[PDB]
Design a protein around this nucleic acid. Structure first.
Ligand SMILES: [K+]
Ligand SMILES: [K+]
Ligand SMILES: [Mg+2]
Ligand SMILES: [Mg+2]
Ligand SMILES: [Mg+2]
Ligand SMILES: [Mg+2]
Ligand SMILES: [Mg+2]
Ligand SMILES: [Mg+2]
Ligand SMILES: [Mg+2]
Ligand SMILES: [Mg+2]
Ligand SMILES: [Mg+2]
Lengths: 136, 59, 158, 291, 168
RNA sequence: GGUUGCGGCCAUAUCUACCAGAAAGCACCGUUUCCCGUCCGAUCAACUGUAGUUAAGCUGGUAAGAGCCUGACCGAGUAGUGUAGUGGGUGACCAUACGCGAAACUCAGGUGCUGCAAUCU
RNA sequence: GACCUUGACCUAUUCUCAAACUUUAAAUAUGUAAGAAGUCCUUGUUACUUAAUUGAACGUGGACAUUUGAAUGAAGAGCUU
RNA sequence: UGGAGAACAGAAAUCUCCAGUAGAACAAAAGGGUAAAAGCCCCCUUGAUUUUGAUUUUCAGUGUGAAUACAAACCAUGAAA
């Protein structure tokens, strides 16, 4: 998925996150006396509806990302689906919701991700962290 | 009339093992180091009492 | 090999509740047990003496004996195809009065009043409880409550 | 003193009175629990507590609702019996112990039956039960967080209560007079302490060496014309008066409950609603809105 | 401003960490005994080290705590050796302070060759009135923030009362 | 209403930072002959309420405070699950029928109540 | 000390997990109760217990009976060798 | 355990203050339990005793082991409960 996206759009055109970590150890035996296996390798247990991979891009670059994910599907067993999210990037906000919160001063950058103003906690420390809110 | 009072232990530790502060890697290397006449008397193992204990080489 | 000690399999059962460790509050010691009282057994893991075996956790029985620190309780344990009577010596920290009985007695009292009240007033009263009954008929107006039509929703992704 | 939310969340508070540093629950359990085959027989503690400035002796029993005072007796009463000074000393402790005993036995109607020791020669004895007649009223000394030491005042109040006719089980080895080597009590020394001998001897010794200090301390004794040698007569006359009329007699009370409350209401700050709380925030954002 | 918040010496602690356990430790005990006028207390090793040459429970070091007037006296005798000059470093964040002397003769003791020579740690603990609140048995509290001893506060006091310098 | 002693339930009571506190109480605070205990009258003991002080403790109040507590047709009738079919699907699993039904989340509110005795503008 | 940069550490965030982790916490399964061997009143016995003429346990005498204390069923119920 | 301080003394010696819900310890596995303690130090001791019964686990409701609550003694400790 990476290789394809970097060729057709360039290495800085997307952020790809693998959203499953293989924590479950597989055993292998190698008669049936004393058959408890030894560790063989590792695997990730996925549910129905569980996100395997996520990609954020500019909306220009939809077709590329969709293709790169399409190419990745052939490496996995079972059926996966490719879904366009209603959310903004890797946030938990619908694209209009995020925009309104950014038009107000309620969002601040925190490296790759973001911090939101809560209407809660000390008033002093909120005004440090979110100056552009309140000012209005 | 001599007398000897000893401080009672409050600690629970009864394994003869030093704490995790005691880590040679944590040593600061940028030290003054007493040089000159300062260093001479402060440097233990630099006297006749030290030499006279050591056994003589057979050369 | 297998292992079946007296407290095998109690890891969670005898743990204290979260943020409820430490000293037993004094009301536990000021409760008064009398022969015939119905008690519920629930081991306090902080009091290792006088402790019930895990089988009796959550069992209710009758006090048959009272001593200095403790009560004797009778429990019926199923063994095979029959119930044997078991007699346990429990310290009071592992016991509490069953509220099942406390709320039955309130009904015996309330029934007595009702029955007395009924004779002097000179009529006849129903003292048995009844199961919840089928609802009777009822008129529901639409004044400020005209029915609002719902339809099933289409599939969306999220 | 910061504490993380996780630390705060998981913390288990001690009981309120352990936080306040007042109740030793370990002791309390052992004091209060009755034998379960005695049913609702209350155990009675003789609670003795020294503030600075006052001795409090209360006879208390327990109940799930809370403890219940049977009787009480404060050293600030003792002026009524002609002790005006050293109201937190060993001799006053004895007197307050004698008072609580005599007051309780009068309330239980048991004061003729159990007189006590009327003589007072500083002798170790418990109250022996009368043959063919009620047993003495039994109470246990509850000294709270006070340290047990030989000659502490708290065993003074004990001695007074025993000598007043309460059965208060005790040993003699923490009275002033207990010789630690030979393991016997000296009644003379205990007797002196009951009548403030240790205070009298000190006034004698000091109105001699440092007359400057004897005026600073003992100012109140000079002012009332009380020589050291009279102390034994104060406490002797005090005991006699205690035994004659132990019955409690409250203060007169200038002003009533409602009047007292009205005055104190005026110095208590009140909570700020939820609308006032809101308005104050709105005002605070408005300040930082400009600048 | 209020007299109840005026600093004083809680206590002075004199400490001699002799490495050895044997003769030299009993000699250091004698030094503190004559200086303090009190029987001093010996500390035992928390654990074996090897490089220092000490074993768990060996019985190295001795110390003694002095309070009241004789703390004031012994402190003066100690500050004479320092020439009334402590560093800013010597003051702790909790507003105690300490210094050290090589050679206990400099305080003012006749030498005696059987005993020998010893350095010391002087450690001085400061508090205000009402510190009993933390120390007593019943109703044990904490000192309020305003009433805590501070580095800033202790230094000002040390300069003002003793007429000393504080360097760096 | 305040305060003390002894409490009940054991955070709506805890924690952090600030501010206020009449009266009384409580407290800090003064002293080292005596009983007593310490390396050290610091703690513990005793003595005086006399020399001083609300500075601290304590009590209350403040905070789009942290924590905790309560509620909600908030999320969610979701997850899970008892029972049913010669239901679907290669399977993995899933839907439906008759029942039971969370936790996180979100929002709103709250922040000790109270017993016995004594005492106080 | 002066800074540019890589590990460490702290603070606020972020993706993902647990048969032998857990604040929380189901469904199903599971103990007890739903009365005459009861309830209330009255006052006898004791060497136990109480400071006690208090209790505890067992009683006397008295009162309350079919709507006597939820539902459904009961082909008889109980006991022994 | 961490922080900040103190001659030699340093990452680690000993002293001091502050923070510290147990992150320690409790012979020995693991789990549970415990903070004016069940941990640490100190004081005194021999209830690690006598006489036999009842009870819980394993269960046949046998034995053995282990354990629980009383009785009748005699003791230890503690001012005492
Ligand atoms: K695939
Ligand atoms: K057995
Ligand atoms: Mg097993
Ligand atoms: Mg045992
Ligand atoms: Mg005690
Ligand atoms: Mg003092
Ligand atoms: Mg103030
Ligand atoms: Mg079928
Ligand atoms: Mg099951
Ligand atoms: Mg058997
Ligand atoms: Mg076995």
């Amino acid at each position: 998925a990476n290789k394809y996206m970097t060729t057709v759009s360039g290495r800085d055109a997307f952020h790809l996150r693998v959203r499953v970590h293989p924590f479950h150890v597989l055993r292998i035996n190698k008669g049936m006396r004393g058959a408890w296996g030894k560790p063989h390798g590792l695997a990730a247990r996925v549910d129905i509806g569980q996100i395997i991979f996520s990609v954020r891009t500019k909306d220009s670059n939809k077709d590329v990302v969709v293709e790169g994910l399409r190419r990745a599907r052939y490496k996995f067993p079972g059926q996966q689906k490719i879904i366009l999210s209603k959310k903004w990037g890797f946030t938990n906000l619908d694209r209009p919701e995020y925009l309104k919160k950014r038009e107000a001063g309620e969002v601040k950058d925190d490296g790759a991700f973001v911090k939101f103003l809560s209407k809660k906690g000390s008033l002093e420390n909120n005004i440090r962290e979110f100056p552009e809110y309140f000012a209005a | 009339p001599p007398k000897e009072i000893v401080k009672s232990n409050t600690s629970s530790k009864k394994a003869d093992v030093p704490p995790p502060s005691a880590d040679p890697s944590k040593a600061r290397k940028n030290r003054p180091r007493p040089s000159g006449n300062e260093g001479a008397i402060r440097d233990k193992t630099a006297g006749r009492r030290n030499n006279r204990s050591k056994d003589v080489t057979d050369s | 090999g297998k292992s079946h000690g007296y407290r095998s399999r109690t890891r969670y059962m005898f743990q204290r509740d979260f943020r409820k460790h430490g000293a037993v509050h004094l009301s536990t010691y000021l409760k008064v047990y009398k022969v015939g009282d119905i008690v519920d057994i629930k081991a306090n893991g902080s009091i290792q003496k006088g402790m019930p075996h895990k089988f009796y956790q959550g069992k209710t029985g009758v006090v048959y004996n009272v001593t200095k620190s403790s009560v004797g309780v009778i429990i019926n344990k199923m063994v095979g195809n029959r119930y044997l009577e078991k007699r346990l010596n429990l310290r009071v920290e592992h016991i509490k009065h069953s509220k099942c009985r406390q709320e039955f007695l309130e009904r015996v009292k309330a029934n007595a009043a009702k029955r007395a009240e009924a004779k002097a007033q000179g009529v006849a009263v129903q003292l048995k409880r009844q199961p919840a009954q089928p609802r009777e008929s009822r008129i529901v107006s639409t004044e400020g409550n005209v029915p609002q039509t719902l339809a099933p929703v289409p599939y969306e992704t999220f | 003193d910061a504490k993380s939310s996780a630390y705060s969340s998981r913390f288990q508070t001690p009981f309120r009175r352990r936080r306040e540093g007042k109740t030793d629950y370990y002791q309390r359990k052992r004091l209060v629990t009755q034998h379960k085959a005695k049913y609702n027989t209350p155990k009675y503690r003789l609670v003795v507590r020294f503030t600075n400035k006052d001795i409090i002796c209360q006879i208390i029993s327990s109940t799930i609702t809370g403890d219940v005072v049977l009787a009480a007796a404060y050293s600030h009463e003792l002026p009524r019996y002609g002790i005006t000074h050293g109201l937190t000393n060993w001799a006053a402790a004895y007197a307050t112990g004698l008072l609580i005993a005599r007051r309780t036995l009068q309330k239980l109607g048991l004061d003729e039956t159990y007189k006590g020791v009327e003589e007072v020669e500083g002798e170790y004895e418990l109250t022996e039960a009368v043959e063919d007649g009620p047993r003495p009223f039994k109470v246990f000394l509850d000294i709270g967080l006070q340290r047990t030491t030989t000659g502490a005042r708290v065993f003074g109040a004990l001695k007074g209560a025993s000598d007043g006719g309460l059965y208060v089980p005790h040993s003699e080895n923490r009275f002033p007079g207990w010789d630690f080597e030979t393991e016997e009590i000296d009644p003379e020394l205990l007797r002196s302490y009951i009548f403030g001998g240790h205070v009298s001897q000190y006034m004698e010794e000091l109105a001699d060496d440092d007359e400057e200090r004897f005026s600073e301390l003992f100012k109140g004794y000079l002012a009332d014309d009380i020589d050291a040698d009279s102390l034994e007569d104060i406490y002797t006359s005090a005991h006699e008066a205690i035994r004659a009329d132990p019955a409690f007699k409250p203060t007169e009370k200038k002003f009533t409950k409602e009047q007292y409350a009205a005055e104190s209401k005026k110095y208590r700050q009140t909570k700020l609603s939820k609308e006032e709380r809101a308005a104050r925030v709105a005002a605070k954002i408005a300040a930082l809105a400009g600048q | 401003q209020n007299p109840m918040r005026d600093l004083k010496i809680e206590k002075l602690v004199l400490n001699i960490s002799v490495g050895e356990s044997g003769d030299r430790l009993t000699r250091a005990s004698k030094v503190l005994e004559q200086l303090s006028g009190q029987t001093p207390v010996q500390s035992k090793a928390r654990y074996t080290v090897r490089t220092f040459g000490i074993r768990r429970n060996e019985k190295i070091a001795v110390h003694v705590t002095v309070r009241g007037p004789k703390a004031e006296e012994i402190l003066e005798r100690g500050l004479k050796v320092k020439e009334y000059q402590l560093r800013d470093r010597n003051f702790s964040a909790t507003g105690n302070f300490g210094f050290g002397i090589d050679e206990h003769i400099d305080l003012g003791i006749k030498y005696d060759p059987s005993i020998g020579i010893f350095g010391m740690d002087f450690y001085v603990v400061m508090n205000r009135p009402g510190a009993r609140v933390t120390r007593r048995k019943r109703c044990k509290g904490t000192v309020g923030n305003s009433h805590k001893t501070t580095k800033e506060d202790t230094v000002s006091w040390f300069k003002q009362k003793y007429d000393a310098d504080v360097l760096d």
